[PDB]
Amino acid sequence: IVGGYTCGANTVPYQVSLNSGYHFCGGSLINSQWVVSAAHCYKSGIQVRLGEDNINVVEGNEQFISASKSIVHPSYNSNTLNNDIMLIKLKSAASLNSRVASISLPTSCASAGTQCLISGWGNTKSSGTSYPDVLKCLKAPILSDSSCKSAYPGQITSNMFCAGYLEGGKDSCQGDSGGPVVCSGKLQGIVSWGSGCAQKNKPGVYTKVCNYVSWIKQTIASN
Ligand SMILES: [Ca+2]
């Protein structure tokens, strides 16, 4: 997250870190056994880390649970990033508490202008590289579909939205991928892609979670 703020420990209780020996992507806890992330974060050998603040220090509220299964969306296209969403099942259920909590799925799509909270452990610089140990947060609005398409000609599908600031300076970034965009207490987006980070006229692009609720629910119900 570039241009954001330190969230505070366990203030974003649905935020997960995906770990394969190291943090590599975010995710969102949607029930005691399932995490939603980006398909471009897929790899084997995932350990889900819940209850994290500093990802390099054991602070006392963590739960580390290996994944049993991952399910990339059936129509994910890694070239275009269309349908950039995946589900990860935990080998054992998380113990839910004030610091480790699910986030609700949307029951309708959010609108441009709605303020959302974007979070992660990704790079905090737009030129250059610095990776935080503690969770970072950014409040940002959803942008109109027409501004999004204009910013990224030929690249924005109906399964994507833009959020952020056209002036630059405030955005998600590498290492935030897979993490949450939460608006009014609902998971509306997944950190997906952008041109660089925090660049003028190049807002963040996010997977549009509301399009996937039926697939998520049906997949969980049978897996
Ligand atoms: Ca920790």
From Swiss-Prot:
GO biological process entries: digestion; proteolysis
Activity regulation annotation text: Is inhibited by scorpion cyclotide trypsin inhibitor TopI1.
Catalysed reaction equations from the record: Preferential cleavage: Arg-|-Xaa, Lys-|-Xaa
Keywords annotated in UniProt: Calcium, Digestion, Disulfide bond, Hydrolase, Metal-binding, Protease, Secreted, Serine protease, Signal, Zymogen
EC number(s) on file: 3.4.21.4
Disulfide bonds: 7-137, 25-41, 109-210, 116-183, 148-162, 173-197
Localization per record: Secreted, Extracellular space
Full protein name: Serine protease 1
Native source organism of the sequence: Bos taurus (Bovine)
Gene name of this polypeptide: PRSS1
